[PDB]
Amino acid sequence: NGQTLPALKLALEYIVPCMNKHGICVVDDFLGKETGQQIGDEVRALHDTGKFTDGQLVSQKSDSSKDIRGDKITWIEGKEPGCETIGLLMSSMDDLIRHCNGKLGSYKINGRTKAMVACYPGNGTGYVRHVDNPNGDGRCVTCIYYLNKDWDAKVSGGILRIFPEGKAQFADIEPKFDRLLFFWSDRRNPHEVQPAYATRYAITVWYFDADETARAKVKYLTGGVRVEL
Amino acid sequence: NGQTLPALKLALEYIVPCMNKHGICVVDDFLGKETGQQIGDEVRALHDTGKFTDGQLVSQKSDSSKDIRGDKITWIEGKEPGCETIGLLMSSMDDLIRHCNGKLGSYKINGRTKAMVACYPGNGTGYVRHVDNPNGDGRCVTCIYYLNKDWDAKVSGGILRIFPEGKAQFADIEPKFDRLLFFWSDRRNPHEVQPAYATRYAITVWYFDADETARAKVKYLTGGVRVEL
Amino acid sequence: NGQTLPALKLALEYIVPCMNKHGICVVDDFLGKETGQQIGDEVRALHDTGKFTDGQLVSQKSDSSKDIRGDKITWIEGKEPGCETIGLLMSSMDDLIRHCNGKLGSYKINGRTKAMVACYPGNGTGYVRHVDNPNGDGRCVTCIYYLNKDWDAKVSGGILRIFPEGKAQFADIEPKFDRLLFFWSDRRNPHEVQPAYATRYAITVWYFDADETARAKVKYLTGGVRVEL
Ligand SMILES: O=C(O)CNC(=O)c1nc(Cl)c2ccccc2c1O
Ligand SMILES: O=C(O)CNC(=O)c1nc(Cl)c2ccccc2c1O
Ligand SMILES: O=C(O)CNC(=O)c1nc(Cl)c2ccccc2c1O
Ligand SMILES: [Mn+2]
Ligand SMILES: [Mn+2]
Ligand SMILES: [Mn+2]
């Protein structure tokens, strides 16, 4: 956990060396309290005004009134009314990555996703062990920003547990307010979200490597590079 | 087989309870004869003016003049010249689904496909056993409208056979004129089209669940949620 | 290796019979020297001005300064400044295919990709054995144009080796200047690029079959045939 808006020093003296050594980097106090609170207010307002999905279907029985649903999501561009501070976070994330370019592995980052805002509703659901990009879709770095004030995992659960490749250990990350996490999106970092027993919010952006994305366009072929005659 | 343009009673008293109990619902006389005949005329005109593909490649030998092809398709938005009544069918299907919303399982339907018009040419080809959505691409309900007047499966074949999960039985559906079929698109309903020995037309729309579709955008990643820096 | 801008005779007397018999067709002197040299100049200028990716990641060790990268690519529409002659090549390829239509197997070609320009940097990397379209994504014909003057595979490597299905033999194709290659994109033609020890350029376009592409839209579902309610 390194310590932070100014961040070139953070990128060059902490994020780049940490990513190249461990593949997992945690920055605490990324935006500061005023800004982090504004983002949390925007995300709660999206939740309270019904902009999230109903949640991943976790258990489906004969009676659909008992169906259990987990993580809820919404995709945010950063330009929508009421999402301007999420947009500021995304710009901040983008400036950090730009300052790392050419220094994160041998990747050359040239694109990203929209922001994926996730809400674990606090009903004991988590997210199963997975790899974000197991099949070469172009995503090289996962970046998550957490929004949960005074989170106490001893009673609320919700820890991100990463299983770094080749090492016999876990890396456990609490989803703390104003924490920014980076990790390699491929099979080097399988991970899971342990059951959350309180409402838990996070915002994820994935960053794309230019070479991997260019050749993915053949595999994930759409109309895309398909055109008329 | 329930019985039908007015249809809120049909949705609430038949379609919703049948889908939640059996996963497979058949509505006969959905649009009535005048309208059903107009749709059939539009589809035959698309066929006769060459708008369908040449058909699924079924057998490919050394000599391509003998290649066997099966089902032919065309994708219809519903706004094209000469497709206005298909467009009316799609609007009718959409109004029905809207009246079911929140009541079909725990799904929240927020999108659909264009209409897939299919023609089995009558040369003994059918469609192999499959699941429509086996990998979580967002499609929750399959809706098929049939256009075949006086169909007699005893001589023309072409029955849809569904293999509902967990039950040791078949559900056999004849592709009858003005019949509308609903079934869950996932692995609950593997199905096949038995060999058709007469020209057989159907129109399919798939309906998307909001949560499943939102998270599919990560799996089926395109430029999509991918954007520039 | 048949012999060539005029080419209807080439399509009808050589390409069509060769593709239907062998699945692999080589045309030498396709555009002639003046035009081929102009294309090579355009491709080298894209390389020299940094328009290619950094190359397929081949070896990734703990230290990313030693990472080995292979083939570099760029996607070209044919209308960009400085790509007009690539655009002429693409138009030439498209006119040839149009003159074959209905005669290549039972396919009906109705679309293509943008041009994929590839550069093997000459560092001993090649491309592993693969099939271009193994899963039914609509691509029926692969068309490659080579740009390498006085290529000598005895010292530079870089041969395309195809492993035609059912036959116990290789088909070895040198990546010669102004050579145009056609082959079926599916599992009939697994192939590899043997290690290249000099800079090696090629331009690939894939051609889509109408039926296979229409039904791929269901499998590779995007927002695509997905639309709002
Ligand atoms: O929230 C966290 O600490 C870690 N979360 C994830 O790893 C995560 N990963 C994916 Cl791929 C999805 C994908 C969809 C919805 C939520 C996700 C999620 O929370
Ligand atoms: O027509 C029928 O009763 C049932 N047909 C299908 O189940 C069906 N399913 C798919 Cl996924 C396709 C897909 C492509 C073309 C035709 C299809 C078809 O008829
Ligand atoms: O260059 C050649 O002779 C043959 N090359 C290929 O077969 C080839 N195939 C694919 Cl699918 C890719 C795909 C991405 C980049 C380069 C490729 C390549 O050179
Ligand atoms: Mn993840
Ligand atoms: Mn089906
Ligand atoms: Mn290839």
Residue numbers in the entry:
A (entry chain A), B (entry chain A), C (entry chain A): 182 to 185, 188 to 406, 409 to 414
Sentences from the paper on this structure:
The ferrous iron and 2-oxoglutarate (2OG)-dependent HIF prolyl hydroxylases (PHDs/EGLNs) catalyse trans-4-prolyl hydroxylations on HIFα subunits, thus promoting their binding to the von Hippel–Lindau protein (VHL), a targeting component of a ubiquitin E3 ligase, and signalling for HIFα degradation under normoxic conditions. The PHD-catalysed hydroxylations of HIF-1α/HIF-2α in higher animals occur in amino- and carboxy-terminal oxygen-dependent degradation domains (NODD and CODD). The three human PHDs exhibit different NODD/CODD selectivities, with PHD3 being substantially more selective for CODD than PHD1/2 (refs 16). Biophysical analyses employing crystallography and NMR reveal that the molecular basis of PHD isoform and variant selectivity involves enzyme–substrate interactions involving β2/β3 loop residues (that bind the LXXLAP motif) and helices α3 and α4, regions which display sequence variations between the PHD isoforms.
A PHD2 R396T variant, present in breast carcinoma, and an R396A variant efficiently hydroxylate NODD, but both manifest loss of CODD activity. Structures of the P317R, R371H and R396T variants with a clinically used inhibitor628 reveal similar overall folds to wt PHD2, that is, a modified double-stranded-β-helix (DSBH) core (β-strands I–VIII), supporting 2OG and His-X-Asp…His-mediated Fe(II) binding. The structures suggested that these variants probably manifest altered substrate binding, but do not explain how their differing NODD/CODD selectivities arise. Comparison of the structures rationalizes the selectivities of the clinically observed P317R, R371H and R396T variants. In the PHD2.CODD structure, Arg396PHD2 (α4) is positioned to salt bridge with Asp571CODD; analysis of the ODD structures leads to the prediction that the R396T and R396A substitutions disrupt their interaction with Asp571CODD, but will not directly have an impact on NODD binding. Indeed, structures of R396T with/without NODD indicate how R396T substitution is tolerated for NODD binding. In the case of R396T (which does not hydroxylate CODD efficiently, 2b), both FG2216 and FG4592 manifest NODD displacement less than wt PHD2.
